Amino acid sequence: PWEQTLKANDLEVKIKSVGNPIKGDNTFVLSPTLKGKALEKAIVRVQFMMPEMPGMPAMKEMAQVSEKNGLYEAKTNLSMNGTWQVRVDIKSKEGEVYRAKTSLDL
Amino acid sequence: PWEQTLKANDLEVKIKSVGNPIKGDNTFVLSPTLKGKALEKAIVRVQFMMPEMPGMPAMKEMAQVSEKNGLYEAKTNLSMNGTWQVRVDIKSKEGEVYRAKTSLDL
Ligand SMILES: [Ag+]
Ligand SMILES: [Ag+]
Ligand SMILES: [Ag+]
Ligand SMILES: [Ag+]
Numbered sequence A, B: 001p002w003e004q005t006l007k008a009n010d011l012e013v014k015i016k017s018v019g020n021p022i023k024g025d026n027t028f029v030l031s032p033t034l035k036g037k038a039l040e041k042a043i044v045r046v047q048f049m050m051p052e053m054p055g056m057p058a059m060k061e062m063a064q065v066s067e068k069n070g071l072y073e074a075k076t077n078l079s080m081n082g083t084w085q086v087r088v089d090i091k092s093k094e095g096e097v098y099r100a101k102t103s104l105d106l
Helices: none
Strands: A003-008 A011-017 A024-034 A043-050 A059-062 A064-068 A071-078 A083-091 A097-105 B003-008 B011-017 B024-034 B043-050 B059-062 B064-068 B071-078 B083-091 B097-105
Touching: A003 A083, A003 A097, A011 A083, A011 A097, A024 A043, A043 A064, A043 A071, A059 A071, B003 B083, B003 B097, B011 B083, B011 B097, B024 B043, B043 B064, B043 B071, B059 B071
Parallel strands: none
Antiparallel strands: A003 A011, A011 A024, A024 A071, A043 A059, A043 A083, A064 A071, A083 A097, B003 B011, B011 B024, B024 B071, B043 B059, B043 B083, B064 B071, B083 B097
């Protein structure tokens, strides 16, 4: 499974796919920590997008995110194969705002 | 099968894959035309590239191109799934220079 550890300001975000990422339905699990302490009850948003490029207009998919057993589960539908940019936006319970970026090849 | 029609000044460039494009060996047929007239004896170059990504170093592949009476066969090996930038460069026998860009999501 696809897995990466991202840095978002002072925050560490581990992201892992449930299975191999493919065109269609996808599930990802996110584990955000701040100085080693897991971020609980946070607002987590995950956006997948392919930027505007020669021959292809920009497209964006917003994941449905839910918190389960201390982890954040992001479900989305990726309508086509190709390279997808991943943007993670987190707002902690205290109001702190963090952002991390990466990309994956489908 | 992948199929696209691009516009380069007065020239139209049709590109079509032989079969469904998949990771590995791929063949494309290019048909450049000027007002319906096939462009024969032209110098045709086709480049496939993936830019630098997290977890992936940049790669560029130049196709091997051959001509058959105005149709140009471009053979290449695309080693990974993901978005490939496609750049077509044509120099006609009469001296015109054209460039068209597109992308292929594998
Ligand atoms: Ag797309
Ligand atoms: Ag694209
Ligand atoms: Ag690549
Ligand atoms: Ag890549």
